Ligand binder design. Sequence first.
Ligand SMILES: [As]
Length: 355
Amino acid sequence: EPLYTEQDLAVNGREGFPNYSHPALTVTPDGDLLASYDGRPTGIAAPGPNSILQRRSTDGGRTWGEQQVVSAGQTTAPIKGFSHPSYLVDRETGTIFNFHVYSQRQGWEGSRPGTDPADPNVLHANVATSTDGGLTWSHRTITADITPDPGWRSRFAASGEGIQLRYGPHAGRLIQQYAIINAAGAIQAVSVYSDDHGRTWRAGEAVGVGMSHNKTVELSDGRVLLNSADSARSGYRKVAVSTDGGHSYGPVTIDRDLPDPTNDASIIRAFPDAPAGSARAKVLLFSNAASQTSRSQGTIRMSCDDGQTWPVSKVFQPGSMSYSTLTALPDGTYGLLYEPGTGIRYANFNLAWLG
Ligand SMILES: [As]
């Protein structure tokens, strides 16, 4: 019964880019898998004129089509880069979003306050929207929409995959996590969300200190669990929980069950369509580097109690393992798009493999 397959989707130096990074994975409403990541073209510019790329599988992840460009970096001055994709599917409308950085002159650290897309010293937040299953895209810079405090100096959508709430008064809400640098220079986490199917986006209340890229997941009772890397380097993930559909979070604490070397992770519902409060609705899967000292020992953990306990875990990548993102596939198995050091690798496993 156990299933664990893997195949590279992007290898550094092949298919036009010296480096590929920052995986995003999703399943379209029609059932295709989309894998996205950024390509850093040959060059020494930083932030570089990266592109957001995509590959599609129409056979459940077995084979993958040609690498396509979602957002094309501009390699001539004025330089423009697009990186760190996150997919978000509105399963009610069928629309697919791909959030990503839009860089010009400044990266994360160098960005300064401002929301004018024409300002090249701002690290901008973009989102691409597709109503045709990811074939074609329209683009928006949404920095102004998601910067309620002009003191916020910088932001990026955490690469990976966002969510749509299924439960409660905000059912249908689309939620994409961001990390920001606030006025005081702290790194905080904040949910960016839409209650109108992606027509408009806003930021919620930022939370925490020493945060980083972070992810959210809807628990069995509709609470939204936020799970962040810790830029203060505790050796663990940081967690907080929202009771208002991701708008605001309670206190942030380190989660001793989730060792982490300060690196990306993903956390998903194993049964995203399970009804509220059901046993299956309590099941979470988590992927990250379990090593506290390096980006290695990629591990999947499972919780059957809304993330309170993680009684099952298994290493999927003993070696180098940086960013990773999980998605639930229609066939009941799980896709895992991750960085083995050589680019972007796609794995598919089932719960039987987890044991
Ligand atoms: As479990």
